[PDB]
Structure 1
Amino acid sequence: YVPEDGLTAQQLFASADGLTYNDFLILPGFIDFIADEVDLTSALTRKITLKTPLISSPMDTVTEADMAIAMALMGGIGFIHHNCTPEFQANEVRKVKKFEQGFITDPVVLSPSHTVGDVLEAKMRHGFSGIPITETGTMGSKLVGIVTSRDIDFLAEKDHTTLLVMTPRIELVVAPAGVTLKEANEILQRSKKGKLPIVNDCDELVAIIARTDLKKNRDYPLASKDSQKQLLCGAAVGTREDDKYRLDLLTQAGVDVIVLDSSQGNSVYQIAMVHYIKQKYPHLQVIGGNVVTAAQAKNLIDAGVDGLRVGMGCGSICITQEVMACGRPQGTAVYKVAEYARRFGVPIIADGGIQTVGHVVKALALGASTVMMGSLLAATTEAPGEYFFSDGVRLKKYRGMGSLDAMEVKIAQGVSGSIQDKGSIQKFVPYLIAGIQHGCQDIGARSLDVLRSMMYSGELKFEKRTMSAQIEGGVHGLHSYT
């Protein structure tokens, strides 16, 4: 016989202290498997399941189409922000939805009546010159030829003659519309050319492959796809009247999941918006606005949401608590809301205040199905914005959607700052996945479902931390370190 050690989650939160992630730890269990065996499949809504629990926040310094595609390939998902025009957002969603691996998205095309000056200008303003030529100058018409650097390079500078310079169609090496990457590899290996146009039965250009892109091909066994094998995308929407048109455009673009974006989701406005979406687009998945309380969650679950976003005041760029006196400590809020919502089969996203891999593991163990990150994913290459240098260190802008800059008397609810560069999402995310798998292995859970069920049965055990313990848990007692 061995007596029990530690606290259950129910005992941990019974004191009503106002705990956050840094106020406790999980106690280790028994190890009988390896960390790579740990399964990370996560419910996002009633209907959508992912293989990874990570989500990119719908902020205008975090998620556009590039971040969304990278997240979906890595196994998560992105939500497109709506601090922009409805047409712009719909175009971003379209770019995510029509992405293909190894193919060019929105090729540049020209007509034979264009000039070599047009090719030179395209090179100057886009960075490439392998531009196919079509009868009408655009996709969906008979292919006539292609022009590249080695066709343009030895001409005299005074020359501005028209194309057709252009190699004829009879000389082109093309493939039918049903190309697969293996056939593309064979064709390009045989032909040695830099482009591989893809045409219709009557020579209508519909797709094109670049050799440089194909050389960099990789495998994504965890990619988030819908039935049509297209990547999954999400979008943010508000609760006003102008958001009806935005919903129409995004639905035409083929968006998969919508999140209603607000700081306090328990309102007649959001309830009416949820009812309208469910009436008009009964196929669409809707995640309800931010709540921190079970009474908040009840109204939106009655309204008919498929998911809940949980958090208020916890985010890194947030001052809402200081300005409004409203919110909740995030660990407590996640535990309470997830405990209530799992009664109805509604998953929750833990959104805000995640700064480490251990915070992610804690959020998943307190009952969340997915985790949303703004600051951790900021300053990656896929993040919107151009890098900049300040004292010799690369930085990117990172601002809250309640900042004054993002609102262009208005009360500011956020701040704007900068985050150091972190590389590519496709390198950063597998690091997080490995950290999560290691935490699950140390705990003794071989999947996140088993982790949450261990928490709800009382098998999982926790300990609180004093400030001294928190200091002792970090780096201490060194002259210097790196």
Structure 2
Amino acid sequence: GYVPEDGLTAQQLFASADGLTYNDFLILPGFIDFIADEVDLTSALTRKITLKTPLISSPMDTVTEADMAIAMALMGGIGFIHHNCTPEFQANEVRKVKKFEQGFITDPVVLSPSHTVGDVLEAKMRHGFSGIPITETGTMGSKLVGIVTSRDIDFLAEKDHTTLVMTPRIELVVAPAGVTLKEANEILQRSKKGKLPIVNDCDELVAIIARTDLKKNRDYPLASKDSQKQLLCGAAVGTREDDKYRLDLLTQAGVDVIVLDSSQGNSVYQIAMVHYIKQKYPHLQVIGGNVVTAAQAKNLIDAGVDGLRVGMGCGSICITQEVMACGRPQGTAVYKVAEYARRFGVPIIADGGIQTVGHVVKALALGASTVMMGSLLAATTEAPGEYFFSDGVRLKKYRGMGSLDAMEKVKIAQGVSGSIQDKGSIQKFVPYLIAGIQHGCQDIGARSLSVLRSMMYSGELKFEKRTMSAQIEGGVHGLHSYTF
């Protein structure tokens, strides 16, 4: 039973009242008894919502729209759709996530027999495809009369702009009502076709599978789905009266969780808004914030929030501390707010400052249930906006929501705008995060993130501060030149 005493407990580490951040300490290693792949990353987002992975995309206009949210839900986490856009735009982005299904086409392009072949060529050059079904109305939920594709069009000269060419319903292969992707794989295997339309018992079109998107099928075991098996989506909302309308559209779009978005969440405006939400939409889960101290947390927890977002001025793009002298170092803040919130069963989100895998493991060890990343997920294929080149390298634009560029679309800049280098894809990079989090938990000695926090609260997890010198030595040093 004797384990020699070596290191500080988390309570002793934070008892000197220095402003510690993630880089100021290290976690001491424990006793390995299991492989890194055995580590369970299951995480509470709110009082009722549980994820299979701790990771969250930040509600920022350069990070999180429906494609980022779909990629994050599928990889095991969740995404929060930003709100620097019209209420109807945001509800449409949520509705795209909530009505996504794997291998099926989302929001199909469709035409009618009175359209011209020129409409197929234009929908190509603005979308990039041409396998477009034909219906009696030209819309959807309407009789499937035939299909048009590039091999129906490719030998027509520019002399010809005929009305719809169309191979008719009598010749099609279709699915009858709704199918698992195995029956779709066998229909597209046995038929050699590029599309599989899906119809109703009354022969309306209702969905499509493309052969290309079916061939790109893969397993998603951590899919992060609601009770009706649709992906989880969150959305951000403000605290003004204009937000009460937006909140209704997001509710109709089927949003699962709302995150009230402020820099200082301990206001009368946010408490009013939380009481309004819990009294109008009692099914809806609310994350308040941002808060850095336990007194802010206490006000919001009495207001009835289901989770807290923790952070103020630690963000990569942030300059709030330099202009208003208000904030807290992020390690200290995460520890204190999470310790207070745990007395009520409320999970917190450690939001901001994350740059490495060690920062994620450190934040999770200090009591955070989930981790929100802006810059770490920015410049992926799934992030909003489009790439550009400068100094011979691919970049994407990343900006603070209180930067002048973000808020112009007397006023004080709380944030900055700048470049981030291309990361590739969420579907390829989130696995690097998950594998690194699991190996860090394995070196620490925790078989799950729940056990990690339980070891930290009981004093079994030990810590160690770092001088400047120890941070220098913990880097790369003494080399002439080296690889990334």
Q: Following the alignment from structure 1 to structure 2, what is the Cα–Cα distance between the partners of residues 195 and 384?
A: 28
How far is 1:304 from its partner? 0.4
Q: Secondary structure of 1:379's match?
A: coil
Q: Following the alignment from structure 1 to structure 2, what is the Cα–Cα distance between the partners of residues 71 and 236?
A: 16
How far is 1:114 from its partner? 1.0
Q: Following the alignment from structure 1 to structure 2, what is the Cα–Cα distance between the partners of residues 434 and 203?
A: 47
How far is 1:201 from its partner? 1.0
Q: Following the alignment from structure 1 to structure 2, what is the Cα–Cα distance between the partners of residues 346 and 98?
A: 29
Q: Following the alignment from structure 1 to structure 2, what is the Cα–Cα distance between the partners of residues 44 and 126?
A: 36
Q: Which whole-Å deviations, capped at 9, do the CAs of 1:204-257 have from their partners, x for residues lacking one?
A: 000011000100000000011001100000000000010010001000000000
Q: Secondary structure of 1:345's match?
A: coil
Q: Which whole-Å deviations, capped at 9, do the CAs of 1:411-450 have from their partners, x for residues lacking one?
A: 0000000100010000000000000000000010000000
Q: Following the alignment from structure 1 to structure 2, what is the Cα–Cα distance between the partners of residues 260 and 175?
A: 43
Q: Following the alignment from structure 2 to structure 1, what is the Cα–Cα distance between the partners of residues 17 and 250?
A: 42
Q: Secondary structure of 2:67's match?
A: helix
The aligned residue for residue 136 of structure 2 is: 135
Q: Following the alignment from structure 2 to structure 1, what is the Cα–Cα distance between the partners of residues 347 and 216?
A: 37
Q: Which whole-Å deviations, capped at 9, do the CAs of 1:304-323 have from their partners, x for residues lacking one?
A: 00000001011111110010
How far is 1:297 from its partner? 0.5
How far is 1:275 from its partner? 0.4
Q: Which whole-Å deviations, capped at 9, do the CAs of 1:278-329 have from their partners, x for residues lacking one?
A: 0100000000120011111011100000000001011111110010010111
Unmatched tracts of structure 1, length 5 or more: none
The aligned residue for residue 88 of structure 1 is: 89
How far is 1:202 from its partner? 1.8
The aligned residue for residue 71 of structure 1 is: 72
How far is 1:345 from its partner? 0.4
Q: Following the alignment from structure 1 to structure 2, what is the Cα–Cα distance between the partners of residues 15 and 120?
A: 69
Q: Following the alignment from structure 1 to structure 2, what is the Cα–Cα distance between the partners of residues 15 and 118?
A: 70
Q: Following the alignment from structure 2 to structure 1, what is the Cα–Cα distance between the partners of residues 322 and 482?
A: 34
What are the residue-to-residue correspondences of 1:248-287 with 2, within 5 Å?
248-287=248-287
How far is 1:20 from its partner? 0.6
How far is 1:178 from its partner? 1.8
Q: Following the alignment from structure 1 to structure 2, what is the Cα–Cα distance between the partners of residues 363 and 297?
A: 18
Q: Which whole-Å deviations, capped at 9, do the CAs of 1:330-360 have from their partners, x for residues lacking one?
A: 1001101111110000000000001100000
Q: Following the alignment from structure 2 to structure 1, what is the Cα–Cα distance between the partners of residues 3 and 207?
A: 67
* TM-score (norm. length: structure 1): 0.99
Q: Following the alignment from structure 1 to structure 2, what is the Cα–Cα distance between the partners of residues 436 and 193?
A: 43
Q: Secondary structure of 1:344's match?
A: coil
- Change in CA separation of 1:123 and 1:3 when aligned onto 2, cut-off 3 Å: closer
Q: Secondary structure of 1:28's match?
A: coil
- Change in CA separation of 1:127 and 1:14 when aligned onto 2, cut-off 3 Å: same
Q: Secondary structure of 1:144's match?
A: strand
Q: Following the alignment from structure 1 to structure 2, what is the Cα–Cα distance between the partners of residues 2 and 52?
A: 32
Q: Following the alignment from structure 2 to structure 1, what is the Cα–Cα distance between the partners of residues 335 and 150?
A: 60
Q: Which moved more, 1:113-122 or 1:325-334?
A: 113-122
Q: Secondary structure of 1:72's match?
A: helix
Unmatched tracts of structure 2, length 5 or more: none
How far is 1:471 from its partner? 0.1
Q: Following the alignment from structure 1 to structure 2, what is the Cα–Cα distance between the partners of residues 433 and 165?
A: 49
Q: Secondary structure of 2:63's match?
A: coil
Q: Following the alignment from structure 2 to structure 1, what is the Cα–Cα distance between the partners of residues 374 and 120?
A: 40
Q: Which whole-Å deviations, capped at 9, do the CAs of 1:118-167 have from their partners, x for residues lacking one?
A: 111111221111001011111111111001111111122201111x4211
The aligned residue for residue 167 of structure 2 is: 167
How far is 1:113 from its partner? 1.1
Q: Which moved more, 1:114-123 or 1:11-20?
A: 114-123
Residue 47 (structure 1) aligned with residue 48 (structure 2): yes
Q: Which whole-Å deviations, capped at 9, do the CAs of 1:173-199 have from their partners, x for residues lacking one?
A: 111122110000110111100000001
Q: Which moved more, 1:123-132 or 1:302-311?
A: 123-132
Q: Secondary structure of 1:321's match?
A: helix
Q: Which whole-Å deviations, capped at 9, do the CAs of 1:355-414 have from their partners, x for residues lacking one?
A: 100000000000000000011001001000100000110000000001001012100000
Q: Following the alignment from structure 2 to structure 1, what is the Cα–Cα distance between the partners of residues 165 and 438?
A: 56
Q: Following the alignment from structure 1 to structure 2, what is the Cα–Cα distance between the partners of residues 378 and 2?
A: 43
Q: Following the alignment from structure 1 to structure 2, what is the Cα–Cα distance between the partners of residues 302 and 166?
A: 62
Q: Following the alignment from structure 1 to structure 2, what is the Cα–Cα distance between the partners of residues 126 and 288?
A: 39
Q: Following the alignment from structure 1 to structure 2, what is the Cα–Cα distance between the partners of residues 472 and 106?
A: 53
Q: Secondary structure of 1:103's match?
A: coil
Q: Which moved more, 1:38-47 or 1:121-130?
A: 121-130
Q: Secondary structure of 1:364's match?
A: helix
Q: Following the alignment from structure 1 to structure 2, what is the Cα–Cα distance between the partners of residues 217 and 239?
A: 41
The aligned residue for residue 16 of structure 2 is: 15
Q: Which whole-Å deviations, capped at 9, do the CAs of 1:50-86 have from their partners, x for residues lacking one?
A: 0000000000000000000000000000000000100
Identity of aligned residues (%): 100
Q: Following the alignment from structure 2 to structure 1, what is the Cα–Cα distance between the partners of residues 52 and 158?
A: 55
The aligned residue for residue 395 of structure 2 is: 395
- Change in CA separation of 1:2 and 1:124 when aligned onto 2, cut-off 3 Å: closer
Q: Following the alignment from structure 1 to structure 2, what is the Cα–Cα distance between the partners of residues 337 and 246?
A: 29
Q: Which whole-Å deviations, capped at 9, do the CAs of 1:255-291 have from their partners, x for residues lacking one?
A: 0000000000001000000000001000000001200
Q: Secondary structure of 1:11's match?
A: helix
Q: Following the alignment from structure 1 to structure 2, what is the Cα–Cα distance between the partners of residues 246 and 470?
A: 46
Q: Secondary structure of 2:442's match?
A: helix
Structure 1 consecutive aligned stretches of length 4 or more whose deviation exceeds 6 Å: none
- The size of the alignment, in residue pairs, is 481
Q: Secondary structure of 2:343's match?
A: helix
The aligned residue for residue 424 of structure 1 is: 425
The aligned residue for residue 117 of structure 1 is: 118
What are the residue-to-residue correspondences of 1:171-250 with 2, within 5 Å?
171-250=171-250
Q: Following the alignment from structure 2 to structure 1, what is the Cα–Cα distance between the partners of residues 177 and 479?
A: 63
Q: Following the alignment from structure 2 to structure 1, what is the Cα–Cα distance between the partners of residues 3 and 419?
A: 51
Q: Following the alignment from structure 1 to structure 2, what is the Cα–Cα distance between the partners of residues 390 and 330?
A: 32
- Change in CA separation of 1:21 and 1:148 when aligned onto 2, cut-off 3 Å: same
How far is 1:2 from its partner? 5.4
Q: Which whole-Å deviations, capped at 9, do the CAs of 1:82-105 have from their partners, x for residues lacking one?
A: 001000000000001100000000
How far is 1:3 from its partner? 3.0
Q: Secondary structure of 1:176's match?
A: coil
Q: Following the alignment from structure 2 to structure 1, what is the Cα–Cα distance between the partners of residues 282 and 39?
A: 35
Q: Secondary structure of 1:139's match?
A: coil
The aligned residue for residue 438 of structure 1 is: 439
Q: Secondary structure of 1:301's match?
A: helix
Q: Following the alignment from structure 1 to structure 2, what is the Cα–Cα distance between the partners of residues 388 and 165?
A: 39
Q: Following the alignment from structure 1 to structure 2, what is the Cα–Cα distance between the partners of residues 254 and 480?
A: 53
Q: Following the alignment from structure 2 to structure 1, what is the Cα–Cα distance between the partners of residues 43 and 369?
A: 6
RMSD of Structure 2 on Structure 1 (CA): 0.7
Q: Secondary structure of 2:411's match?
A: coil
- Change in CA separation of 1:388 and 1:246 when aligned onto 2, cut-off 3 Å: same
Q: Following the alignment from structure 1 to structure 2, what is the Cα–Cα distance between the partners of residues 340 and 138?
A: 53
What are the residue-to-residue correspondences of 1:305-344 with 2, within 5 Å?
305-344=305-344
Q: Which moved more, 1:422-431 or 1:110-119?
A: 110-119
Q: Secondary structure of 1:372's match?
A: strand
Q: Following the alignment from structure 1 to structure 2, what is the Cα–Cα distance between the partners of residues 258 and 2?
A: 45
How far is 1:168 from its partner? 1.1
Q: Following the alignment from structure 2 to structure 1, what is the Cα–Cα distance between the partners of residues 157 and 346?
A: 67
Q: Following the alignment from structure 1 to structure 2, what is the Cα–Cα distance between the partners of residues 258 and 145?
A: 42
Q: Following the alignment from structure 1 to structure 2, what is the Cα–Cα distance between the partners of residues 202 and 91?
A: 28
Q: Secondary structure of 1:175's match?
A: coil
The aligned residue for residue 463 of structure 2 is: 462
